[PDB]
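Journal club prep — side note

Before the paper discussion, L.F. wants everyone to see what a predicted structure for a comparable chain looks like in token form. Sequence:
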Amino acid sequence: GSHMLTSFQAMVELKQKILTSISKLADRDTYQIAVEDLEKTIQSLTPETLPMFLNCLYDSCSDPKPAVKKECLHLLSYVCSLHCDSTAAHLTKIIAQIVKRLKDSDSGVRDACRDTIGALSGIYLKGKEEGTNTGSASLAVGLFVKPLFEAMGEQNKVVQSGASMCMARMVESAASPPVTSFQKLCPRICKLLSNSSFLAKASLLPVVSSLSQVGAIAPQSLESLLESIHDCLGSTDWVTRKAAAETLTALASHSSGLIKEKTDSTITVLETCRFDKIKPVRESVTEALQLWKKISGKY
């Protein structure tokens, strides 16, 4: 009756203001004051006025003008930074909107996607593995990896590349990284790197490098990982070969104790690849070969 109608009027007025500021973001001189107005509205959000702002951002994330999309992704980040406990429930829809935006070719849009994924990981994946229970960590990491792997399943190299960059940034952005929950990514990344349909292996190898940096390499999948990296060293794209060499470098540099025994096959493949016609490939192969030789002991 009266209370429902009053809440309706308040909600519609707030949506009016939000959409007006978001549309005015599209202008160059009316961009900064609109940013300030949207931030001031973010500050005064409550658990009931939060989902309406999120729905505004969602419906605004599809505007053709790319600056609007970039700022809406940054606003998703901002609202998660200012109301993390309140947005932990809508995290799923948020990550879904980011994965939907992964298909854009605009550099700024893809960079905003990666930065938003990183901010979300830094907020919700920090310290998620401190104690005896390991259930909230699994759910948290899954909220990120399930849509990312689904986007990696699409037949679009742009989307696969974006998904891989976002997954790498997610692994990198966790302060106290959930290593056990992050190790669940290796058995799928192996199959993706061995898959011929996957077209963004050069973007997925840095994900392996990042997993090695935080020490989240699954030892039961390490041999298949090395096999897929050898395959990538065998690729026709020089970028993929250089990326595989640099991932071998990262593995020797951060998973040193994990690869001590299994070096000879990787060293042999590097020996066969040290005379690549592409000079950057030559240099990366030489670097990885020296590192693995020193880890093993050829002196």
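L.F.'s comment for the group: The CA atoms of residues 186 and 218 lie 6 Å apart. Keep this in mind when we get to the figures.
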